[PDB]
């Protein structure tokens, strides 16, 4: 969720240029961003981010049931650029933004905006209303080309903040050997018994509900071998744009 990165990453952009959501959102899915080629000082513009996905897609909800996808986003603009105030928001763009709440990543980072989790079938395309700065009003902003970075996600993540995997990822065998027994759980889930005949050790691999295993009793499994299919149908994508803060003259 966007709050997981805000609560534990100071700035969401890594040194390799990777957005922090890719640490738990491990599937890669395309992200798009449309921004105006150039904007004037003190003007409102729209940043349109597209997080595209196949709509008949059903993911594994955290309770084993199958459900719809949720979308989230992280917009990184240059210093000076911020979320346009409601009085500067035209009514033609007010219905465009629906009723989303854009939050700042941290209270002092007014140039980093986050939104989500929002409904997928509704906000596959999000419009962020940004206000361009004025140079004669801020001595650090200047007329020039500036970078804009966006991160877009759709779907449940695979890793939690403590390092625990969720049920939206592959379950791998903690040890090689032969499967001696597969206990189908009453309310869903499985208990897999592995006889590591090589180390004379028995291990019990627990599989959560919502996942189907591709393993049978009496089968030889290797360490790290995938025990069930990967039920992840979502992904995280990264995009980039350049904007021209233009002088009103020439």
């Amino acid at each position: 969720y966007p709050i997981f990165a805000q609560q534990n990453y100071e700035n969401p952009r890594e040194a390799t240029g990777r957005i922090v959501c890719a640490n738990c959102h491990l599937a890669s899915k395309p992200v798009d961003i449309e921004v105006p080629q150039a904007v004037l000082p003190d003007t409102v513009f729209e940043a349109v981010v597209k997080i595209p996905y196949d709509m008949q897609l059903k993911q594994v909800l955290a309770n084993g049931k199958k459900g719809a996808l949720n979308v989230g986003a992280v917009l990184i603009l240059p210093e000076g650029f911020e979320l346009a105030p409601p009085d500067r928001i035209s009514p033609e763009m007010k219905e465009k933004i629906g009723n989303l709440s854009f939050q700042n990543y941290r209270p002092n980072k007014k140039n980093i905006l986050v939104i989500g989790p929002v409904p997928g079938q509704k906000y596959s395309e999000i419009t962020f209303p940004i206000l361009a700065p004025d140079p004669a009003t801020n001595k650090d902003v200047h007329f020039l080309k500036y970078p804009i970075y966006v991160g877009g996600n759709r779907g449940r993540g695979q890793i939690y903040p403590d390092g625990s995997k969720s049920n939206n990822t592959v379950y791998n065998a903690t040890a090689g050997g032969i499967i001696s027994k597969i206990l189908r759980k009453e309310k869903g889930g499985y208990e897999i018994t592995i006889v590591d005949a090589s180390n004379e050790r028995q291990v019990i691999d627990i599989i959560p509900r919502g996942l189907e295993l591709l393993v049978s009793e009496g089968e030889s499994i290797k360490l790290d071998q995938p025990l069930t299919s990967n039920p992840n149908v979502g992904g995280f994508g990264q995009g980039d744009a350049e904007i021209v803060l233009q002088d009103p003259l020439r």
Binding site: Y1, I3, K66, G67, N70, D162, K165, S166, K187
Partner: protein, 99 residues
């Protein structure tokens, strides 16, 4: 017994995350911020049998809006254990101590 998921800025945690009720009371789970906060009772810490889908939420009924609440009418006496589906490994979980 009034549990409000999410604090007032971004605190993902059941408040309270542990209360005591009896047969006839009603539990509530109002989500404020950090949605969705749909809770689902698991069949690992339940006292009586009963199905988990009877006291848990479905995939179509999710608490993603700031105002929806999930009420569960429990009558059996024992200690249940529900948790935020969209945040089970996060750390926000509660339990119904009905007796």
């Amino acid at each position: 017994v009034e549990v409000l998921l999410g604090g007032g800025d971004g605190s993902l945690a059941f408040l309270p995350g542990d209360f005591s009720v009896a047969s006839g009371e009603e539990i509530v789970f109002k989500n404020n911020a950090g949605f969705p906060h749909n809770v689902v009772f698991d069949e690992d810490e339940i006292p009586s049998g009963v199905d988990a889908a009877k006291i848990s939420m479905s995939e179509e009924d999710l608490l993603n809006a700031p105002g929806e609440t999930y009420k569960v009418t429990l009558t059996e006496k024992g200690t249940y254990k529900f948790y935020c589906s969209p945040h089970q490994g996060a750390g926000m979980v509660g339990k119904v101590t009905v007796n």
